[PDB]
Amino acid sequence: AAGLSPYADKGKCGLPEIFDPPEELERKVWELARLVWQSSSVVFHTGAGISTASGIPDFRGPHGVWTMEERGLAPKFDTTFESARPTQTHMALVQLERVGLLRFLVSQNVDGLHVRSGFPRDKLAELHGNMFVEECAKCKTQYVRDTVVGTMGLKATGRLCTVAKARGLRACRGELRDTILDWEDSLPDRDLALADEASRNADLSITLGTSLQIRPSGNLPLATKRRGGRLVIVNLQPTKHDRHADLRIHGYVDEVMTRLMKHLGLEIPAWDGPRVLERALPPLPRPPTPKLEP
């Protein structure tokens, strides 16, 4: 958290977790599988809760980084960012995207795991940054790195731009900066615009592991509802937009995505290691029609 503003509003931290009882849970995940299948345009919105299984703390859960700071304590990192492994949720999103069942992914996560899982960059908006990505302040070229860039808050990293310029081939030499927003920084223009278009034209927005307290990210899923679509919120704690959910699921997100993939006859791929993909591969064909809840 180094060099960052100490003036931030941290929101509501430490709310207790709720656990849907198993029968209710199984029935809600069947309903989810149906709306995924019936929906043409499906948009996912992910926050810190989809990376807790990998050892990275959230911000506002019972043991979140903000929650611990309010109460005098430091947080507990089990894993480093470099050694963190994509979860079954991350890998399930790769596969959903492969078979046409995911249109776009909006993430508030700076952990680099979507990118490292193999999720195509062109269907991903990292609205708050990525610890592995630095950007040239002069020509806006991004560099995806294998280790974390070392600064946060849109500061200079100490490295310079290596791009050969269209006329004359001379290195740009612009200042490289981290892409990690501080509190009250402006969101990335293009990524926000794309996340907004996707969210406005969706039939179904599904949120996973966000409490939706931060804007404008936290509000993109409402846009969906505004234009006739449905909204599914999956989170252990309550979320700010609970009252607008068509379907709420209080359970572990790995657990929901495992059952959801079972109900749609999809295999969740294993993760070979960090593998950056710039452009979505050609679609695998839509799956064979899934079976029903007896």
Partner: peptide
């Protein structure tokens, strides 16, 4: 130029 905040 939308900004990362609570409200």
């Amino acid at each position: 130029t939308a900004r990362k905040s609570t409200g």
